[PDB]
Symmetry: D2
């Protein structure tokens, strides 16, 4: 485990789910990993289990928590090589009339502005290390998703912002890339399914959304992140799809509330 | 009907299906339309019905038919403003081991090289008119399709070649664009469905592949083509999707022969 | 001029630039056009010149202005067929350390949340009319842009949100599409150039960014919008590029502050 | 070096350039590498230098050479885990009127049909091993390139065919992915530059096409390939861009033969 030995890595939302899979991936590569999370429980458990990981309580929507996160990372470890902006939320399914501008703003604070604020504060140090930024976006930023207008918007912004940052930071040799996971089996996925009338039917539909026939694992996103940080030196501004092929081929897109005619009038 | 008055337009495969929808769209816009088709029946019927359309028998895989097509178009009408490369075939569903290199080559001759050969012979005249090329590709060139390796490859080539041509021909102000239809209800679609064990179930699945809940119509591709030729003067090298949103959102991609686990092991 | 006769169309930011080009395009197609703009001068001039256009002062970042815009549109004209979310701003060039979270939020309010709020309030009426939404995004949402992190992010969100809306609204047959202009010669473009040390050198570089060798015109975006509203009935969730081919081919991407080695060490 | 230990890997065109970089990457990961190349010199040198690599003379455009390649690979090593279709050619710059249908066909034989034929013959064994296919396409398949219509077309086909194969082979858990390199410093790149009036000016323009300010290295493509084969188990049908960001941001796209107006008429 030496492909990223000695590098200092900040992972937001690293207490569980994809974040924890990324923390473990970088630890196994030899990095010093600073777990940023608003929830103490998961981070402390990872901090105690993994020696290379330390936990720093930090809500990325609070400018002062993030400034303290960066300040403590430099003071305690002297450098910063990689920022993985993973902290993010997916609300329950909401139709457009079931969304509010206030909830949209709240979601932007977390999914977009938290990623922006940490990136900006980290860039002075990433420039000195010739480090790199990895944003965790989502496939639905590229292809849309039903009943998720605010969420889809925040992820479209993250993917685009990744490319803008890659252009701004290329003169320092600082790479900025993003991973777009499709359906990854995580506590978030499980919690959203548990809100549905038939949780396991929902999970099964999520599995059938991939030609590979399953959801991904946090560990597979984690391997994608370590590859971007440690072995993708000619990649900047890319969108690495970790989706099981969900974007490929024809599927079933007409919804249960969507008027569809019988097959004797195929084109209306 | 004057948005493309007086322009000379060649439409390959214009005897039926999307081609005929494009012929009718351009005729209604005021163009002189040369129907190129290997089948006399459909072209002659369109030629007789539509005064602005004439029919010239031409198999686009035969270099001499195409050279005669261009030569006759200039001799009879003095100019050439728009080439719509629409002639193309989709074979029945074939697994990769059910394809041959020889059939692939045959399909390349039609779907790709016929489009290439007419474009090359037309370019001297398109340059004088500051005309434009419109290639009919397919959505599956961008997202893939099951059981269609040779077909998907030819359409990936057409879409890419469209962009290469747009770069080569931009110094003459000749635009080169493509339309990528998804599922369009045509005689080709009907013939392929009729080979399946349950034709109407197949048609219905094709309808459900779109969030809009239906297949498109040749007339809707035809309107897209007239827009590209007549009102899209700042568009070159674009891929205009006419797909009903089939590429959007999560669907059902794990095939009936694809081992999928029960939802108690969601990520393998 | 009848391809959109009798339809009621709201165009935000319609007082000048691309917005005015869209207003004129829809008026010429026969629509009733409600010009929404925060600046009275341009809207009143268009309102007085064009009979089919009326002006309603409205700042799209103010929820009450938008609610009054929709309320007045229905009260005065009885229906709503098309919403063109065009109001938007591009700040001067700013490096990431020259951006603030507060300016980002302000830009999100205009470029994203104003588009969201009007869309949500309009959807009850668009559903009754089977109308459609057209968002004006930008090419840089797809490919990034230097010195424009907040702007690029807002446009990435708009493009993605377009696709989410297309999925949510497809059961009503309401289409939701976006246009991504590249470099369009507008007062905004002129004002940004005028901030540069060499305005005309900047304009010239903007012209050279396109294989076609020029910037686009508001009228060309306007024609793209009328096509989406009136003749693209099988298009939903698409990104219509109006860019002159700026995304095509290799160009010059290493910036004047970017360390580039001599050509005797080509790969570092 | 154990991330791909014991796997049998066929690399076409592995004698030099990107192919050799991929051979070395897989050897260092522990694989048994079968170098396929039409040129004995480079392959024999790699075979002798690297113990895990053996060389089998094979022209991928000859169906019998490929059938013998697969037959010998199984007979000598009992299995097949990964096929890297890298063999390919880029002709010198050719305008469309400087291309022939015959040269296009020749280029399709190598760039597309050689990749197709080996893939088809390999699939029975890849299915037993749950292996994977990696195609080396190109960025210009996605964004076009000037003076390269036949080349661009072949790479558009490869990228699309990759996605079709990913759908067909997902029920066996066989992944099919592609890498799209941008400008990689290779003997091919050097040979093409040496045909230009100013080779080093050409190389320099190739370096300036990337925001990172350099071309990539075969080793960086090689690391991307090992990642796809060994650690990307939830990726299928993806296009992994190894391009230095060449696709990002605005550049200089109006060619030296392209009429461009002075900046006092910016939009024509
Ligand atoms: N799970 C999927 O299928 C999926 C798909 C696409 C994208 N994603 C994205 O991946 C990321 C992780 O998703 P997940 O499924 O692992 O989620 P999760 O809920 O399982 O884990 C998210 C973690 O982030 C932390 N977090 C949340 N808000 C925070 C804040 N304000 N400050 C700091 N930490 C905060 C949580 O406490 C938690 O530990 C998110 O950005 C999500 O949008 C997930
Ligand atoms: N129908 C769809 O859903 C769909 C989807 C995506 C792309 N497309 C593409 O659109 C085009 C038209 O498809 P369609 O469904 O209308 O097909 P179709 O079979 O209904 O019509 C094709 C026409 O082309 C003619 N043609 C065939 N081979 C020819 C040749 N060698 N020379 C000259 N003319 C020839 C046929 O005689 C026929 O008139 C094709 O390129 C097809 O691949 C269709
Ligand atoms: N000009 C380009 O090259 C270009 C490129 C890509 C995208 N775009 C987008 O196209 C749209 C129009 O751009 P433009 O160049 O015509 O700009 P512009 O500045 O010339 O015109 C914008 C109009 O919107 C109005 N507006 C601004 N803020 C508003 C608010 N809060 N409420 C209501 N109206 C408001 C302005 O008063 C003005 O009339 C924007 O969304 C912009 O981001 C433009
Ligand atoms: N170099 C770049 O910048 C670049 C960019 C994009 C894509 N690519 C692609 O990457 C691949 C390798 O490119 P490269 O620059 O390393 O090329 P190269 O010329 O340096 O090496 C290609 C190798 O393939 C072998 N080969 C050629 N024809 C063959 C045949 N018929 N059968 C077997 N082997 C054959 C050659 O002998 C040589 O060893 C090609 O597919 C190319 O199109 C390269
Ligand atoms: C299926 C699987 C999913 C999902 C959503 C779906 C449903 N898509 C349908 C197509 C548009 C309307 C609904 O979100 C995560 O996994
Ligand atoms: C559904 C609808 C279609 C179609 C194909 C399908 C089936 N897609 C499944 C996902 C990959 C395996 C099979 O071709 C035209 O319309
Ligand atoms: C050229 C033309 C433009 C532009 C920006 C550029 C500059 N691009 C370079 C590549 C990345 C660093 C800078 O914005 C509008 O028109
Ligand atoms: C610049 C760098 C390159 C290249 C090509 C170019 C030139 N592009 C210009 C934009 C279209 C017309 C010409 O091929 C490899 O590296
Ligand atoms: Cl969805
Ligand atoms: Cl399919
Ligand atoms: Cl830029
Ligand atoms: Cl180019």
């Amino acid at each position: 485990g030496t492909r990223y030995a000695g590098k200092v890595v900040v992972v937001t939302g690293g207490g569980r789910g994809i974040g924890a899979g990324i923390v473990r991936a970088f630890v196994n590569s030899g990095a010093r990993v600073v777990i940023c999370d608003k929830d103490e429980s998961g981070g402390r458990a990872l901090e105690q289990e993994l020696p290379g990981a330390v936990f720093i309580l930090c809500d990325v929507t609070q400018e002062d928590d993030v400034k303290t996160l960066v300040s403590e990372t430099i003071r305690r470890f002297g450098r910063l090589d990689c920022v993985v902006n993973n902290a993010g939320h997916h609300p329950p399914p909401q139709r457009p009339e079931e969304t509010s501008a206030q909830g949209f703003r709240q979601l932007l604070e977390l999914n977009l502005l938290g990623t922006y604020t940490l990136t900006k504060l980290a860039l002075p140090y990433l420039r000195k290390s010739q480090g790199n930024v990895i944003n965790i976006s989502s496939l639905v930023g590229a292809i849309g998703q039903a009943q998720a207008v605010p969420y889809v918007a925040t992820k479209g912004a993250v993917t685009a912002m990744t490319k803008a940052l890659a252009l701004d930071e290329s003169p320092y040799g600082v790479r900025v890339n993003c991973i777009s996971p499709g359906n990854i089996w995580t506590p978030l996925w499980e919690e959203l399914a548990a809100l549905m009338p038939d949780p396991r039917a929902t999970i099964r539909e999520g599995m059938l959304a991939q030609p590979l026939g399953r959801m991904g694992q946090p560990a597979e996103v984690g391997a994608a992140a370590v590859f971007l940080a440690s072995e993708a030196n000619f990649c900047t501004g890319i969108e690495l799809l970790v989706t099981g092929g969900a974007e490929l081929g024809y599927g079933c897109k007409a919804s249960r509330s969507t008027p569809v005619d019988a097959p004797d009038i195929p084109s209306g």
